[model samples]
Target: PLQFDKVSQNVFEQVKETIFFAIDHTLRKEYGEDIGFIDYNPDKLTTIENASNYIYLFWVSVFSELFTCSKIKKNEWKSLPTVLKSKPTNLNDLRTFEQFWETVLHFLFSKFTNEEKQSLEKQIHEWKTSINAIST
Candidate 1:
């Protein structure tokens, strides 16, 4: 059996890397240069600060990435300051925010059948495969 914990086995790093890998995955190949966002390699990404700030920018710009961030455009949302200016990292909070934004990005993008929808659907099929890991 694969036994683990973020404390010793570095499961946090493992879990973290999975998010980075799965973020774009094959979707990057769909647009190539047009991915319009930098999918930073997780191991290469040091610090929750960078991860927080870096991710904030991508979704905000996924206006360029939705065609993309916020607090009032940070203060307005609970995860706002916690993520954007995060100093003391909150994994559950950060993680909760992750779910919010990840879904938000997709939900917002999924609406663009007029422009991005065609390009968008291609990703959904591959995205389902993302669920193929251990979750089922």
Candidate 2:
């Protein structure tokens, strides 16, 4: 549905500045800048003109970072084989982008400490509420 496509990407763009900085800053505090920095134009690339490239780059940065997490490499990586779960290359459609976002969040939450989880969860709930305010 275009509504889902539009709404999901709309939320991403509207929330990018705050969400990216917050997540990148928090991750850097623990993992160091090299691995944590997302290194992409958060808002600019989100324009309709850059739709195809936007999510692909986002997925690349995200999956690349998660791919190198030594913790995931050791603990729950057996299911991540390219044959089984390859990183997405292009954005011909939007559904896969949502799936990748979901996987990233799930993997992140799985790795965070209990306190860290609560901290991140709070931000997400706030984002959700903000989305609800406009959406509802």
Candidate 3:
């Protein structure tokens, strides 16, 4: 299990920059500025330290899931979430964070295994509830 964790982290570090670049670019294109519902620190985007935040972790999980499930060719990170072959559509269709997360949940439930699904459900629920408690 330790090996699995290390290898996963290694792969994440390897692809981290590319994923962040893509997501940040797409978000800024649609939102104009202050990308997310909350700023997710776009100024300091390409670093492992930001993974401690829930929003960053959520996107990281999404990129990891997309990479694992899709058939993106080597170094072709842009062709993801449907790239390897699919109907042409606008990536900027998701205009709000709610819409984006809805799409994320759809892809996640469709591709993730039972354990992976459960793990995400638990962690995300906890994160949401924790934030709710803080606000309330």
Please name the candidate that would achieve the greatest TM-score relative to the true structure: 2
Runs in model 3 with CA error above 4 Å? Answer: 1-99
Give the whole-model CA lDDT for all candidates, comma-separated. Answer: 0.40, 0.42, 0.40
Query: Against the true structure, whose lDDT is highest?
Result: 2
Residue-pair clashes per prediction, in order, are: 19, 0, 0
The TM-scores, one per candidate, come to 0.32, 0.33, 0.28
Shift of residue 58 alpha carbon in model 3, Å: 20
Q: Which runs in model 2 stand beyond 4 Å of their true positions?
A: 1-8, 14-23, 31-92, 113-136
- Report the C-alpha lDDT of model 3 over 1-136, residue by residue, as the tens digit: 1223333333233334433444554445545655556565577765433422323344443445444654432333332343212221222221122233333443434444677567546644543443233321
Worst 10 residues of 2 by lDDT: 83-92
Model 3 residue 47 CA deviation in Å: 8.4
